[PDB]
Amino acid sequence: IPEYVDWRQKGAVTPVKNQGSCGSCWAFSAVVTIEGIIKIRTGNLNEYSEQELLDCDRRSYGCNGGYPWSALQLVAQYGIHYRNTYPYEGVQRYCRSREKGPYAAKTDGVRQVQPYNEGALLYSIANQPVSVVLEAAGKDFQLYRGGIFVGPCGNKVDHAVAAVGYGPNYILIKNSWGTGWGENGYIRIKRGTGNSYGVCGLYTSSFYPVKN
Numbered sequence: 275i276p277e278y279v280d281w282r283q284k285g286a287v288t289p290v291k292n293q294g295s296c297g298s299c300w301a302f303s304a305v306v307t308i309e310g311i312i313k314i315r316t317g318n319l320n321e322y323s324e325q326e327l328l329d330c331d332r333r334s335y336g337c338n339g340g341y342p343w344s345a346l347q348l349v350a351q352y353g354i355h356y357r358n359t360y361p362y363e364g365v366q367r368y369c370r371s372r373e374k375g376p377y378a379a380k381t382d383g384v385r386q387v388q389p390y391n392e393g394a395l396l397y398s399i400a401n402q403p404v405s406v407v408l409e410a411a412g413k414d415f416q417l418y419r420g421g422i423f424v425g426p427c428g429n430k431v432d433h434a435v436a437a438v439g440y441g442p443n444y445i446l447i448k449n450s451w452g453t454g455w456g457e458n459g460y461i462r463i464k465r466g467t468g469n470s471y472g473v474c475g476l477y478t479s480s481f482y483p484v485k486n
Contacts, residue, residue: 275397278439279399279440281402282439284313287319287403288309288319288320288321289453290449290452290453292450293451294364298336298450299433300327300342301327301328302434305321307436309321310436311482321358322378323359325367326369326370326371327354329367329368342481343386343479346381346405346482350381350382350383350384350483352380356378359374382485383484384481387480387482392477396465399445402483403437403438404436404481405481405482406445406477407432408435408447408463410435410474412426414426418455422443423464423473427475435450437480443464443466445463
């Protein structure tokens with residue numbers, strides 16, 4: 275795999291979103307990976323519905339948090355609608371898939387990256403955007419403005435995001451806190467420290483969709 279990856283340069287990443295006060299990061303994270311794999315497999319970049327996963331993933335807890343893996347399983351079992359068909363409202367509502375017509379896209383499964391393994395995560399990122407988790411509660415992460423972030427942070431993961439690239443000293447992360455946070459909505463997080471948790475626990479729990 276190469277020394278630099280940046281799926282934005284391959285046209286596989288949509289604009290940065292803002293989840294608002296709702297604890298829906300798990301759905302935003304999942305959607306980034308769906309947008310990426312559909313572009314990689316079909317050549318078209320589309321936006322898909324975080325709100326649909328928020329409403330319809332019965333294993334997750336709406337705005338009280340949730341699981342990227344179960345959101346991705348929902349897209350593999352059923353499918354997902356375009357964002358315009360099912361736009362983001364920032365509050366959990368009833369699942370309205372069955373009233374919004376046929377699904378726009380469908381995947382074929384979900385895989386987990388071997389946890390606590392930097393090279394395994396880089397290998398997956400070289401192939402597609404990946405859903406990852408990290409500890410975002412610390413003020414240093416909250417106030418990040420730019421540069422390669424080293425912390426301070428612990429490993430008590432609480433926030434799902436998406437890895438869309440990497441370089442020799444960092445992993446490139448699309449956050450869901452709007453374009454005014456970080457590097458136009460992104461953070462580069464230090465890698466190569468030898469801590470098996472990853473900086474801010476970045477290697478704890480990583481999943482990606484499979485699409486034939």
